[PDB]
Amino acid sequence: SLVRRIISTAKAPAAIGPYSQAVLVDRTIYISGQLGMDPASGQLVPGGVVEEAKQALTNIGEILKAAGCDFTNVVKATVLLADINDFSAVNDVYKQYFQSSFPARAAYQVAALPKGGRVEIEAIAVQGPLTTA
Template identity: 40%
Template sequence: MARKAYEAKSATASGPYSHAIDGGDYIYFSGQTAKNTPTAEDMTGDIAAQTKQCFKNLFEVLEAANLTPDDVLKVNVYLTDMGNFDAMNEVYKTFFNDPYPARTCIAVLALPLGAEVEIEMVAKRSS
């Protein structure tokens, strides 16, 4: 089976990967950072702005796959500083409705391109 990929027009890949791959019922989204845009602004220190840009990138791919935020089942958030957890959560909760997707949030030493947050998702097509 050939892989079917979905891409965002306004996001870039910082390596050899697709923005999302169709796995049949499930769509797997690669992590996005605020730096994955051709006109990436320097948002260093502004975790709220970075989180918002991550979701803007991800939701553009979600739309390309003909899905909505309600189709998202799982989200993984990577932070370079857990001191940013509350600020990330304030933005995060504006992108989903209750009940929220399952989520994992972990601290990492570093992220590509000097980003301070990276977010990836898994969504499922409705039957």
């Protein structure tokens, strides 16, 4: 018998429809893809891909928080871009949220994201305590 619980925080855009912000099953946390949406206005923050990336990571942070975790628990992330040329800029924003023991990752350009977003990020985390390498 494994425990499964739905993560939900008002500090991140509400999950409207048949999905959850994140699902914690046993020790693993699956987080839905996050866009650069402001939790309050439900709209994408202005500024373009760079600011959208900050918000998307902010949203991920709040979800991790609600699950008793922080960015150090992320083991895998997927960076979806609307334009492969934004790779470098998003990478520099991305590194602002991690110190070391970085997560495994995949990054590429898709044809289009919801709401005309320029970037969407999804991740997988493992609830602590963790005994690093």
